[PDB]
């Protein structure tokens, strides 16, 4: 009786590969009912899984569906995953950036239900840009330009879709082996040969303390070691929002700034770090140092920006947004939230900035909502900055003037100290 599988995990014993395969296959097909799977997931929450178990679980979820074939795209396929957070524009920058030095970027994604738009929602800020190409045109564009984007249509990791939904309604999301296997299985099924992970830490991150962030990163790197997909993880800071802009059109404008070498310092450093790992793992550089140098040169010489222009134009977008960002959707109203006193920024509560952006309408809440891509916010002070009373802490971009609740949430989220504060560490450590 299937109950034995639950009992075994409950008692702290390691499931075999055969048992993990059996339970995932039966749950996927309906042989194992949801109430047994949820008891099993709670037992995992308390007793965990070994590295061998976690890798077996990852591959059982990969095998539950289809695997995207990228063999006709020349080169190693390296993919990036972040748990993300408020202001994380890295995906918009990293594509053109690494593609400009020869790393093929075969980007597949789907419209999310998150706190901002997904990559597709954001890129659709660009007039004329649309992602409705078939797989052949996708392959062609990647081999020609080294970058393209398509909407995910494959039946990937159906077992993960099902199990993550169940976890979400049974208080079993917060389990390192379940999180690690979910994320990695999705990247492997999408055809990654190698994987770069940005694991966030701090109050704005998925894992709310550094130890947990490190354990998650380690778990995913070990999965990759065992399934033959080299994986490297950077642990980076989300104690405050990244960069300045939170939104859709606003984050595209900031990404354009960053590709020109004049973006926020934190986003620039993060994109250079993640991208150096992507370039090295893709074997388009002989070392991380060489990869970093190539990306700094591509930025300063304008090649990453030209790559972005090629990418936009190839799928219908008006690349002139790079010269004239006013062609992105513009907000009807702008408001300056003034500082109430002199001081130094000691904290920006990332979760609350995210909530403020959501209240303005920058994110999706129902499976399909239409999003006003013009709205959001641009922070002007980050942790460590000096502030004078009356100085603008943030600009609020809205489609109406009825934003008192947004003003109050943002004012409360920006914490000042009367004495100077140090910059937090951005890049904590690399796990490989």
| Separation CA 228–CA 250 (nearest Å) | 39
Name the pairing type of β-strands 343-348 and 386-387: antiparallel
| Separation CA 391–CA 376 (nearest Å) | 19
- Figure out which of the listed residues 29, 33, 134, 209 binds its own copies, where binding follows CB under 8 A: 33
Binder of residue 84, out of its own copies, ligand URI, none (CB less than 5 to 8 A by kind)? ligand URI
Neighbours of 385 (CB within 10 A): 16
| Separation CA 306–CA 84 (nearest Å) | 26
The answer to whether residue 209 is catalytic is no
Question: In the bound complex, what is the minimum distance in angstroms from residue 405's beta carbon to ligand URI?
Answer: 25
Count Cα neighbours of 201 within 13 Å in the Cβ-side half-sphere. 22
Q: Which is nearer to ligand URI, 109 or 135 (CB)?
A: 109
| Region of 169-177, 342-350, 385-393, 403-411 interacting with its own copies (CB under 8 A) | 169-177
Q: Which is nearer to ligand URI, 173 or 411 (CB)?
A: 173
The reply to whether 97 sits near its own copies by the rule CB under 8 A is: no
Q: Which is nearer to its own copies, 165 or 293 (CB)?
A: 165
Binder of residue 157, out of ligand URI, its own copies, none (CB less than 5 to 8 A by kind)? none
The answer to whether residue 167 is catalytic is yes
- Figure out which of the listed residues 36, 185, 201, 231 binds its own copies, where binding follows CB under 8 A: 36
Q: Are 180 and 54 in contact (CB under 8 A)?
A: yes
| Separation CA 21–CA 181 (nearest Å) | 13
Which residues are bridge partners to 335 per DSSP?
A: 396
The reply to whether 178 sits near its own copies by the rule CB under 8 A is: no
Binding site for ligand URI (CB under 6 A): 83-84, 164, 173, 178-179, 182-183, 186, 206
Binder of residue 42, out of its own copies, ligand URI, none (CB less than 5 to 8 A by kind)? its own copies
- Figure out which of the listed residues 15, 24, 28, 45 binds its own copies, where binding follows CB under 8 A: 45
Neighbours of 11 (CB within 10 A): 9
Residue 353 Rama label (left phi>0; alpha psi -120 to 50; beta): alpha
Q: What is the DSSP string of 238-267?
A: -SS-SSSEEESHHHHHHHHHHHTT-S-HHH
Residues that bind its own copies (CB under 8 A): 1, 3, 6-7, 10, 33-39, 41-43, 45-46, 166, 168-172
Which residues are identified as catalytic? 81, 160, 167, 182, 186
């Amino acid at each position: 009786h299937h109950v034995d599988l639950i009992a075994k995990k409950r008692d702290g014993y390691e499931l075999s590969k055969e048992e993990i395969d059996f339970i995932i296959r039966g749950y996927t097909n309906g042989d194992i009912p949801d109430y047994q799977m949820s008891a099993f997931a709670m037992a995992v929450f308390f007793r965990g899984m070994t590295e061998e178990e976690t890798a077996a679980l990852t591959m059982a979820m990969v095998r539950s569906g289809d695997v995207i074939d990228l063999s006709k795209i020349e080169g190693m396929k390296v993919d990036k995953h972040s748990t993300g957070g408020v202001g994380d524009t890295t995906t918009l920058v990293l594509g053109p950036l690494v593609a400009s030095v020869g790393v093929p970027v075969a980007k597949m994604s789907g419209r999310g239900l998150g706190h901002t738009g997904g990559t597709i929602d954001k890129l659709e800020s660009v007039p004329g840009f649309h992602v409705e190409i078939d797989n052949e045109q996708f392959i062609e564009l990647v081999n020609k330009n080294k970058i393209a984007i398509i909407g995910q249509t494959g039946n990937l990791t159906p077992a993960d879709k099902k199990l993550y939904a169940l976890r979400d309604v049974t208080a079993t999301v917060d389990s390192i082996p379940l999180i690690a296997s979910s994320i990695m299985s999705k990247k492997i099924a999408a055809g990654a040969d190698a994987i770069v992970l940005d694991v966030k830490t701090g109050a704005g991150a998925f894992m709310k303390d550094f130890a947990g962030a490190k354990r998650l990163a380690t778990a995913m790197v070990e999965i990759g070691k065992r399934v033959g997909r080299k994986t490297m993880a950077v642990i980076s800071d989300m104690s405050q929002p990244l960069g300045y802009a939170v939104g859709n059109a606003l984050e595209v404008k900031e990404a354009i700034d960053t590709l020109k070498g004049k973006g926020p310092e934190d986003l620039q450093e993060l994109c250079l770090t993640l991208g150096s790992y992507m370039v090295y793992l893709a074997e388009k550089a002989s070392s991380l140092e060489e990869a970093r140098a190539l990306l700094e040169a591509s930025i300063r010489e304008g090649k990453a920006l030209e790559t972005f222009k090629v990418f936009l134009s190839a799928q219908g977008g008006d690349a002139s947004v790079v010269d004239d960002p006013t062609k992105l959707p513009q907000a009807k109203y702008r408001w300056e939230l003034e500082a109430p006193e002199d001081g130094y920024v000691a904290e920006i509560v990332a979760d609350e900035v995210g909530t403020a952006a959501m209240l303005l309408g920058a994110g999706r809440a129902t499976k399909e909502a239409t999003i006003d891509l013009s709205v959001g916010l641009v922070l002007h002070k980050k942790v460590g900055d000096a502030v004078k009373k009356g100085e603008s802490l943030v600009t609020i971009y809205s489609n109406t003037e009825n934003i008192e609740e947004v003003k109050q949430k943002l004012a409360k989220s920006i914490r000042l100290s009367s004495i100077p504060v140090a910059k937090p560490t951005l890049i904590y450590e690399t796990i490989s």
